[PDB]
Amino acid sequence: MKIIRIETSRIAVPLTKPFKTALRTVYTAESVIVRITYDSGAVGWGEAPPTLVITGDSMDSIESAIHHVLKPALLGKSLAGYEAILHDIQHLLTGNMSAKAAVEMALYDGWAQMCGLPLYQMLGGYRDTLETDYTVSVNSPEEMAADAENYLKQGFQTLKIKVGKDDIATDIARIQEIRKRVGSAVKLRLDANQGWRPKEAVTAIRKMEDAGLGIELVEQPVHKDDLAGLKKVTDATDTPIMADESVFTPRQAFEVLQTRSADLINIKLMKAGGISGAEKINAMAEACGVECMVGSMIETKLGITAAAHFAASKRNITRFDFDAPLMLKTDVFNGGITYSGSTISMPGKPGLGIIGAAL
């Protein structure tokens, strides 16, 4: 079992290098941290960063949401009736998806703790390890290529290249400089972050294909609301197109799957309001032959631990984008998932396996 306390606190950990996308730049990772204590003494953990240009959630909005709305309705409830709690978390307020997701992470932590198994095993237990990409931030062709060379040196053979921030011809210059420096063996994932127009993206993606640049997929090439435009890019190229900002919820997912506007979907807990929605998105996509990748916002190893446990559980989730914690100057959590280069291994303790604040 039973919820009996919900607390929050803040963390702020500067990034080593600034993370740069077409939407935003981030110098310091901010995050609200949620702790649910249950009647057994056991503690469930949770996280939500501010993403004002993606979800609209600020640190203030989240902490308010959790204390004023979610907390009064959750105190005293049992994990034996977790469906009623999930419904409450998702319908006692509209929007506020990052708040809902922090609370759901702690909830699933204690639920698997209650059942006595690691959370990823509780949800299907499909794999014990998984490979994460590393993100190359948008910068000059030269900076991006040296970033990529170093990430390959750290053990990462799959790089996620941010593009779409200014003009398209420079994006191509960026990829060629990365390819000419790193070799044609490594997998390159593009993410345009809504920065291209559909016909523009088609022409550029064919140009990259034809130059043998070896693009694995392209994330959300067009504006999130332009579903028909996304379909156009998907239908026009040989390169897999992955919806991201287009699909937050199950309802939005259903719309993308039915129109067939994309080949892959990017699932994030912040977007889906936690694991319950992420799981619903993946299942619906699995039935349509649509594979999913699980990523994150700029989050600590906590929120990546929740994401990895969910991503680890499902057969249909075949890619993983869990590089955020490696971007920070310090690791502010004890336990959870462990990295070994690109390989993320799952823990053995019941739940998320997050012991607590690091030292």
**Residues numbered 134-163 forming contacts with a copy of itself, rule: CB under 8 A:** none
Select 54 or 145, whichever has its Cβ closest to a copy of itself: 54
Segment interacting with Mg ion (CB under 5 A) among 46-54, 150-158, 185-193, 206-214: 185-193
Give, as ranges, the residues between 247 and 286 that touch a copy of itself (CB under 8 A): 249-251, 253-254, 257-258, 260, 263, 280, 283-284, 286
| Least distance from a copy of itself to the Cβ atom of residue 334, Å | 24
Beta strands at 158-162 and 338-340: parallel, antiparallel or unpaired: unpaired
- 331 by Cβ neighbours in 10 Å (0-12 / 13-18 / 19+) ranks as middle
Q: Which residue's structure tokens are 């994932």? A: 189
Contact 172, 208 (CB under 8 A): yes
The rounded distance, in Å, linking the Cα atoms of 290 and 267 is 12
* Partner interacting with residue 219 (select from Mg ion, a copy of itself, none; CB below 5-8 Å by kind): Mg ion
The rounded distance, in Å, linking the Cα atoms of 304 and 68 is 26
Tell me the one-letter amino acid at 120.
Y
* Partner interacting with residue 315 (select from Mg ion, a copy of itself, none; CB below 5-8 Å by kind): a copy of itself
Residue 160 appears among annotated catalytic residues: no
Give, as ranges, the residues between 192 and 231 that touch Mg ion (CB under 5 A): 219
**In terms of DSSP H, where are the helices of 18-167?**
59-64, 71-74, 82-91, 97-115, 119-122, 141-153
Contact call for residue 244 and Mg ion (CB under 5 A): yes
Binding residue (CB under 8 A) for a copy of itself from 123, 175, 243, 269: 123
Give, as ranges, the residues between 38 and 57 that touch a copy of itself (CB under 8 A): 52-57
| Least distance from Mg ion to the Cβ atom of residue 127, Å | 22
Contact 219, 135 (CB under 8 A): no
* Partner interacting with residue 92 (select from a copy of itself, Mg ion, none; CB below 5-8 Å by kind): a copy of itself
The CA-CA-CA angle for residues 262, 198, 238, to 5°, reads 50
| Residues with active-site annotation | 162, 268
